[PDB]
Amino acid sequence: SLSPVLLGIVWTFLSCGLLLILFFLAFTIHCRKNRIVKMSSPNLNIVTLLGSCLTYSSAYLFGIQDVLSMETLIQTRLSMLCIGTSLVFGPILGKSWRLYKVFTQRVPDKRVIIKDLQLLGLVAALLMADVILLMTWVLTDPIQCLQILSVSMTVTGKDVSCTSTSTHFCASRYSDVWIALIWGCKGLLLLYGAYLAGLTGHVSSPPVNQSLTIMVGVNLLVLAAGLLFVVTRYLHSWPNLVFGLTSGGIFVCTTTINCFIFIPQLKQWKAFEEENQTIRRMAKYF
Amino acid sequence: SLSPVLLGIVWTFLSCGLLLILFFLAFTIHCRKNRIVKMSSPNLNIVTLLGSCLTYSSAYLFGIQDVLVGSSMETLIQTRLSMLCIGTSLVFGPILGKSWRLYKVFTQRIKDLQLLGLVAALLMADVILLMTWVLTDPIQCLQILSVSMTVTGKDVSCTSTSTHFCASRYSDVWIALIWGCKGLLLLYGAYLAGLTGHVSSPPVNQSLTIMVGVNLLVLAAGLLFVVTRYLHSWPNLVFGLTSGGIFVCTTTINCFIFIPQLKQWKAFEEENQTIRR
Amino acid sequence: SLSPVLLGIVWTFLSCGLLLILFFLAFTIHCRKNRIVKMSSPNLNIVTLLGSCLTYSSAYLFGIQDVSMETLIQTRLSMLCIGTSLVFGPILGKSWRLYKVFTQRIKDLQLLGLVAALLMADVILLMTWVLTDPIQCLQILSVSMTVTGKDVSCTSTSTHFCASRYSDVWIALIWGCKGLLLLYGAYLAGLTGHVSSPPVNQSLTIMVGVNLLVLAAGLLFVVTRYLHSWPNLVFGLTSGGIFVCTTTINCFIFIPQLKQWKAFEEENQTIRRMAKYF
Amino acid sequence: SLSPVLLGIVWTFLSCGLLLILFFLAFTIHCRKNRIVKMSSPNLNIVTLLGSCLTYSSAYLFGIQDVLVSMETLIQTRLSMLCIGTSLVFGPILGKSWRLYKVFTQRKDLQLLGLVAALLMADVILLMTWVLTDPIQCLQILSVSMTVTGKDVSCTSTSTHFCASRYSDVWIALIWGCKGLLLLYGAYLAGLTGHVSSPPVNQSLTIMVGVNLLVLAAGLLFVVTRYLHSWPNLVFGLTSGGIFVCTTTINCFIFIPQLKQWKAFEEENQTIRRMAKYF
Ligand SMILES: CCCCCC/C=C/CCCCCCCC(=O)OC[C@H](COP(=O)([O-])OCC[N+](C)(C)C)OC(=O)CCCCCCCCCCCCCCCCC
Ligand SMILES: CCCCCC/C=C/CCCCCCCC(=O)OC[C@H](COP(=O)([O-])OCC[N+](C)(C)C)OC(=O)CCCCCCCCCCCCCCCCC
Ligand SMILES: CCCCCC/C=C/CCCCCCCC(=O)OC[C@H](COP(=O)([O-])OCC[N+](C)(C)C)OC(=O)CCCCCCCCCCCCCCCCC
Ligand SMILES: CCCCCC/C=C/CCCCCCCC(=O)OC[C@H](COP(=O)([O-])OCC[N+](C)(C)C)OC(=O)CCCCCCCCCCCCCCCCC
């Protein structure tokens, strides 16, 4: 079905990205008490990294074809993408909202319980929205792999033509409804994320400020989703191209998001440790 | 197939919206030199007014069936969709330009010419996409009658459907292109609205207008995409929903732009009258 | 020459102020690790409370009259200068750190080093004041014949005062350096204006403190210079000005922390009550 | 009395500064409708320049000595001119900063003129109270003082003639105090508008430089006037130099960016005009 060379290349790239995510997770857990890591949100960074792992896993699953049960495979690979995107992007919006609310306090500080509940609601409520949409899609209009043989007798204003096509595709009866819903909810939450990124545009440094990561992420996500919807819909007779493009889009988006989140943490951690070592040796020498 | 009552109600609502648009245009052209109107960029508002009237015109065009005088339904669909696209571009360009100017003035301080040039570039992108859509494949209407046997691996069903629709061969690709470029524009507009957050008063600060407009645009566009895709056997429902969405979005955006200007103008003039006496 | 009643009232007020300062010190030492206290730089608040203690001690020292007197006056004036520098340094450091983290991002050691340089400026000025010319007390008796060009008047005055030969130069120096510091502090308070909550944003406290500081310094300079034949008035006004300024600044620093802490632990207690109920 | 060379040099420098103020006034009035000038506050800049003129005029008066043998009113008017000139220089800048802060924090020249009118009325009532209650008197006193320490005794013979007020330090502390409170609020305003716009519109740097230079100059000149009355040339030169430096620095910081951004605008206009002529 799919060429072994493309499968090997995609598997290698996905495994390398997964190893990078594991290294970031190890850095976050081990250096959790460090000032550079602590001034970030390591507990939210964990959720982002689990979402990244889910996205890479779904990218792996996209390569299985003509093996399985196929309806459940498509349903679970797509649900994994949706939940992974929610888990990747919710924490970043929560961090931006926290940074915005910290630096715009007033006399009516409200209550810390309400602030914590709103922070939890900018993540868990989004995840629950995706969960209920996926449950409604699965229970109401599940993906069905059906084969149609059909003869079509179309006619234009003056020309008559006849076609006879047989195809084997897996999709829902009302697939565009669920597409418009999930695309729509993600787009509204990402518009609010862009608003939050703008509101906190120059409020702190890239390790704490998350405006650039949000903007790059939303733009890349819109581009990748727009491309992949179209190529999956129309270039269904190009299995290698569709698989490679889907894996590449998922890989690029996840890797760019995580690199933008974590590379500055590593840079400032190295700088802080170098400063500490310099002062330690200067004190020891004297 | 369109009920006269729905047509009458929709026409009256769109006419009232157009009269509101013309009132705002007269207000912003007559009272150009006033401080309240002048500080809100009266020249850039003309483009928004023209885009709004173009969108209302497209909403009118959505309500006629068959042919005008022996004409082509293809041309009607193409022209109303392109009118809607150009109108939304012209509505949302000036607001983003005003927000960008406010941001740049706030941060290490832009004439109207540069903003109009950026809006013109946006319009050129939309025009290029519309032109390549029209030339690469038109929206030709086809009569599709066919018989298909469905084999799910457990049951066999035969159906005979005679369907007529006006669409492109690859219509989802053009949908993806137009929606995607508009969505990138809206993402940058939301970023700009956040950047100019609580930077001035609402007459000068066009930040709530952007956030209301982008959300209304996304919601209406998704709803109407789905409804047109699937509920094509409900011409009255499709027409009413499309006209209602266009009217609601355009009127909300224009009111959010112009009600602060009008009330601040009234307050300023009343204060001047009190001072003079 | 000072009434016992005024002495007792002033000492009771200063002792209550010291008790309040010690209560704030206990609160900020015990509740070091709390979020509300930790986000308000508990290490830089110790320096402010120490400076407040020095200022209250100098206010106490202002009330003893007879017994050398030069060492007493120099001691209390230098204590006041050191205490006010220690009070106002940490607030400026906190505002500077808030500005730096807000504007494209500072350890406590760097801020304490800046405060140490600020203190060293005052130490240098006080040392050169004490060594160049001390505050020796002289009994001056003289006969003066005034000729204004239209009338002739004669007066004989026997006056005693403790001052330096060039006292206004040292005044203008100390006042000038403190005023430059206060102007930069007001600039910092403006920069970090409506940037965070009161316990973190030390902006109203800076403005109130500098305004009260200028007012009290001007009033007490004039009163000491001219109303020297009113010992009770001078003592009461000096002690009251010191007490009012110090107490106002420290209350503005610490009362927001106390109420936010009370709200925080009230919320925690409600959470624990809900957990126990289920 | 005073050396002719120092008098000539000080008069030359003050005249050059006054001509610079006149040039700035001509530029402000002539190009009052220009966009760069209009987005500034030319009506308030006129008040600043008039205050600068008063401050430059008082420096000339500080050089008149041993001529009006009349000397009390000369000192009173030269000092009142300084106080009013400082008020008129610094009030408009604070008003511009406050207007900029209020425009960009929302939920007009007449109002700012009223505010600076109140600011000047404060100085007017202080100066009137000083003149009416405790005016300057030029008095000559001869006296002998028997200074005795704890163990040492000495006698001195002093005969001096100085023009000063009886409670001079009271009025000093008052005027210094009110000015210092206004300068503290001005520094607060400069902080509030720290990075709100460009230097032509933003006035934070000019405010901070002005308040620092003003405090430093006033502190120096108080001490040298008090303790170096036997150095007439030194005190005259230092007072004139401080006044000149403060006024010139403040006015340059206000107006040089306007000239820069006006010349750049005119150059752009000329370039586009030439391009239009080409096509
Ligand atoms: C941070 C990293 C994560 C981001 C990765 C972005 C990559 C997305 C690629 C997956 C999307 C293309 C696949 C479409 C569905 C498909 O395979 O067809 C089966 C079918 C549709 O098939 P079909 O319609 O494409 O082909 C049949 C054509 N026919 C003519 C018959 C209709 O899927 C569905 O029925 C819809 C299920 C929706 C579930 C959610 C999809 C996954 C969500 C992941 C993106 C969400 C986040 C981004 C949103 C956008 C930004 C606001
Ligand atoms: C501020 C006011 C502006 C907001 C108004 C929002 C209202 C939109 C309603 C019109 C859109 C639905 C109609 C879709 C096309 C149609 O009718 O079918 C003909 C066809 C599609 O037909 P079809 O697919 O819908 O039905 C046939 C089904 N079949 C199975 C055969 C495929 O149109 C096209 O081919 C695509 C043309 C693209 C041109 C652009 C459309 C106008 C753009 C206006 C919105 C852009 C701005 C907002 C975007 C959202 C934010 C990112
Ligand atoms: C936060 C709490 C701190 C604020 C408390 C404010 C209270 C200040 C009261 C003390 C100042 C008045 C006493 C003056 C000296 C005196 O007593 O006479 C002895 C003498 C002067 O005597 P005399 O000149 O006043 O009387 C003699 C008159 N005769 C005619 C002879 C000249 O002292 C000196 O010689 C100068 C000593 C300078 C040392 C520094 C003084 C203490 C500084 C404390 C304030 C600094 C911070 C604020 C600065 C202002 C804002 C920028
Ligand atoms: C922006 C441009 C303006 C800035 C120019 C700054 C320069 C100031 C120099 C003038 C001040 C020194 C002269 C003092 C008075 C004098 O000459 O002696 C006669 C006398 C004092 O004499 P004497 O005490 O110096 O000498 C006699 C000594 N004896 C022992 C006898 C007392 O003046 C007075 O009586 C007081 C009158 C007060 C009127 C106001 C003075 C002018 C105000 C100008 C500055 C205001 C703005 C800055 C304020 C500070 C910042 C917050």
User: DSSP string spanning C143-205?
Assistant: EEEEE-SS-EEEEEEEEEEE--TTHHHHHHHHHHHHHHHHHHHHHHHHHTTTSS-TTT--SHH
Say if B and A touch: at least 3 Cβ pairs within 8 Å. yes
Site from B33, B105, B264 to mutate, D interface, most D CB atoms within 10 angstroms: B105
Q: How far apart are the first and last CA of chain D?
A: 70
For B113-122, letters b (16+ CB in 10 Å) and e give eebbeebeeb
**What secondary structure, in 3-state letters, does chain D show?**
CCCHHHHHHHHHHHHHHHHHHHHHHHHHHHCCCCHHHHHCCHHHHHHHHHHHHHHHHHHHHCCCCCCCCCHHHHHHHHHHHHHHHHHHHHHHHHHHHHHHHHHCCCCCHHHHHHHHHHHHHHHHHHHHHHHHHCCCEEEEEEEEEEEECCCCEEEEEEEEEEEECCCHHHHHHHHHHHHHHHHHHHHHHHHHCCCCCCCCCCCHHHHHHHHHHHHHHHHHHHHHHHHCCCCHHHHHHHHHHHHHHHHHHHHHHHHHHHHHHHHHHHHHHHHHHHHHHHC
Distance from CA of C15 to the nearest CA of D (A): 30
Q: Where are the alpha helices (DSSP H) in chain B?
A: 4-30, 35-38, 42-61, 73-106, 112-136, 171-195, 208-230, 235-276
Q: Give CA–CA dist B104/B95, Å, rounded.
A: 14
Alpha-carbon dihedral angle through residues C37, C43, C48, C53, given to the nearest 10 degrees: 100
Asked if the Cβ–Cβ distance from D107 to B199 is below 8 Å, we say no
Residues of B in contact with A150 (CB under 8 A): 146-149
Q: Give CA–CA dist D85/B119, Å, rounded.
A: 50
By Cβ distance, the residue of B140, B176, B230 closest to A230 is B176
Residue A129: Cβ within 10 Å count: 15
Q: Give CA–CA dist B129/B150, Å, rounded.
A: 37
**DSSP secondary structure letter of residue A169:** E
Contact yes or no for D82/D174 (Cβ under 8 A): no
Query: Which is the closest atom of ligand 4 to the Cα of D243?
Result: 5
Experimental method: cryo-EM
Residues of B in contact with A223 (CB under 8 A): 180, 184
By Cβ distance, the residue of D106, D107, D201 closest to B109 is D201
Nearest CA to ligand 2 atom 26: B229
> How many residues comprise chain A?
286
Q: Which of A179, A220, A245, A255 to mutate to test the pocket of ligand 1 (most atoms within 8 A of CB)?
A: A179
Query: Ligand 4 centroid vs D186 CA: distance in angstroms?
Result: 21
Contact yes or no for B113/B137 (Cβ under 8 A): no
Neighbours of chain C (3+ CB pairs under 8 A): A, D
Residue type, D73: T
Q: Give CA–CA dist B135/B213, Å, rounded.
A: 31
Residue type, C149: G
* Size of the C and D interface in Cβ pairs below 8 Å: 123
Q: Give CA–CA dist B159/A46, Å, rounded.
A: 52
Alpha-carbon dihedral angle through residues A122, A124, A129, A132, given to the nearest 10 degrees: -170
Q: Give CA–CA dist A97/A110, Å, rounded.
A: 15
Q: Give CA–CA dist C112/B102, Å, rounded.
A: 40
Q: Give CA–CA dist A237/A231, Å, rounded.
A: 10
Would you say the CB of residue C18 lies under 6 angstroms from ligand 3?
no
In sequence order, the β-bridge partners of residue D65 are none
Residues of A in contact with C197 (CB under 8 A): 105-106, 109
Pairing of strands C137-147, D137-148: antiparallel
Residue B265: Cβ within 10 Å count: 18
3-state secondary structure of C65: coil
Q: Residues of D at the C interface (Cβ-Cβ below 8 Å)?
A: 137-149, 167, 169-170, 173-174, 176-177, 180-181, 183-185, 187-194, 208, 211-212, 215-216, 219-220, 222-223, 226-227
CA neighbor of C246 nearest in space, from C207, C211, C200, C213: C213
List pocket residues of ligand 4, CB cut-off 6 Å.
D 55, 75, 79, 82-83, 86, 89, 162, 164-165, 168, 171-172, 175-176, 179-180, 183, 214-215, 217-218, 221-222, 225-226, 239, 242-243, 246-247, 250
Q: Give CA–CA dist B214/A66, Å, rounded.
A: 42
Pairing of strands B141-151, A144-155: antiparallel
Residue D156: Cβ within 10 Å count: 10
Q: Give CA–CA dist A275/A266, Å, rounded.
A: 14
CA neighbor of A133 nearest in space, from A168, A98, A81, A90: A81
Pairing of strands A160-171, B156-166: unpaired
CA neighbor of B103 nearest in space, from B197, B8, B36, B14: B197
Residues of C in contact with D169 (CB under 8 A): 221-222, 225-226
Asked if the Cβ–Cβ distance from D212 to C180 is below 8 Å, we say yes
By Cβ distance, the residue of C102, C198, C267 closest to A113 is C267
Nearest CA to ligand 3 atom 45: C81
Neighbours of chain D (3+ CB pairs under 8 A): B, C
3-state secondary structure of B110: coil
Pairing of strands D137-148, C152-162: unpaired
Residues of C in contact with D176 (CB under 8 A): 218
Q: Give CA–CA dist D211/A89, Å, rounded.
A: 49
Residues of A in contact with C263 (CB under 8 A): 111-112
By Cβ distance, the residue of A105, A109, A203 closest to C102 is A203
- The strands making up A160-171's β-sheet, listed across from edge to edge, are A160-171, A144-155, B141-151, B156-166
Phi, psi dihedrals of residue B141, rounded to the nearest 5°: -85, 140
CA neighbor of B159 nearest in space, from B141, B169, B172, B144: B144
Pairing of strands A160-171, B141-151: unpaired
For tokens 């007072």, the residue is: D239
